[PDB]
Each structure stands twice: as C-alpha cells, then as structure tokens.
Structure 1
C-alpha cells in the first residue's frame, strides 16, 4: 500500500531521488510533469524500470518483492500528484 511505499522509498530510492529529484540524470525527475514527459507516468512503466534498471538506475529484482515494488511505484505516483 501507501505507507509501505513511503518506507521502501526511504530505504532504497531517497539517495538518488530525494524529494522527487534525480541526482544522477537531472531531467529524469520523479515530478509529475517529468513522469508524463518521459512516459513513466504509470504503475507498469515504473514497476518495470525498478525491476530491470536502466542506465544509472539499478535493478531491484532480487531485493524488493513485487509487492513492495508495486507499492513504491504507487508512493511515487502519489507524491508526484502532491508533488513532493
């Protein structure tokens, strides 16, 4: 759910995406407008990138359960709307 995404995000994502930014590839933020722009505004899109990684973003298949992954894709999606 939502409170478990907030916890998973704090443990695995905050280093690079603190408060919705992207320290590694600056334009590829977690902001709503950016998520729309790169077509990552979806639970499908996020859950697959988190799984297989992409460029500087690591893969999280192996250490996140696809229940925690679905939940953190959803936390991302919820703060983006609120925005951050």
Structure 2
C-alpha cells in the first residue's frame, strides 16, 4: 500500500467520525490498537471488509472509493494504530 495516499483518504473520508483515532458516533469503537484487537478488527482484511460494506452507522464505501484507496486507508489505519494516534 501507499500509506501517504491512505492518510489523504482518511482525512477526507474517515476523520469526520474517527477524528484523531476516536469515534464520535459510537465511542467504544475507536481506531486504537487495543480497541481494534477487542473486536477482531486489527487486520488489513478486516478493515477493508468494513470500509467496503459499512456497519450500522458506518457508511459503506464500495464504489465511492477505488479498490486502491480502500486498501491504502486500511493499511494507513493499522500503521497509525501501531504508531499511536493523535
């Protein structure tokens, strides 16, 4: 993946909800590593899935973002989570 492209994707499409790695809609479902691991979401393929199909209040991004942008944002989120948010 292109992590830098991911970050741009994130900025425009994900951070209105996941501001600085949080979650303004459902405050237990953050992008922090510990949180992701609690729900079996700390993997590229898990995130790609979720971004593609949505879940509840999280919008689906299928055929709004390209395949490459969805891969790249997933890779960005895991890499930010691993480094630490904010």
TM-score above 0.5: yes
Structure 1 residues 34-80: Cα deviation after superposition (integer angstroms, max 9, x where no partner):
01001100011000100000000000001111110000001000110
TM superposition outliers: structure 1 runs of 4+ over 4 Å: none
CA RMSD of aligned residues (A): 0.5
TM-score (norm 2): 0.96
- Structure 2: unaligned runs, 5 residues or longer: none
The correspondence of residues 1-84 of structure 1 with structure 2, limited to 5 A, is 1-84=2-85
Residue 18 of structure 2 aligns to a residue whose secondary structure is helix
Cα distance in 2 for residues equivalent to 1:44 and 1:31: 17
Give the Å deviation of 1:82. Answer: 1.0
Give the Å deviation of 1:8. Answer: 0.2
Q: Number of residue pairs matched? A: 84
Residue 79 of structure 1 aligns to a residue whose secondary structure is helix
- Structure 1: unaligned runs, 5 residues or longer: none
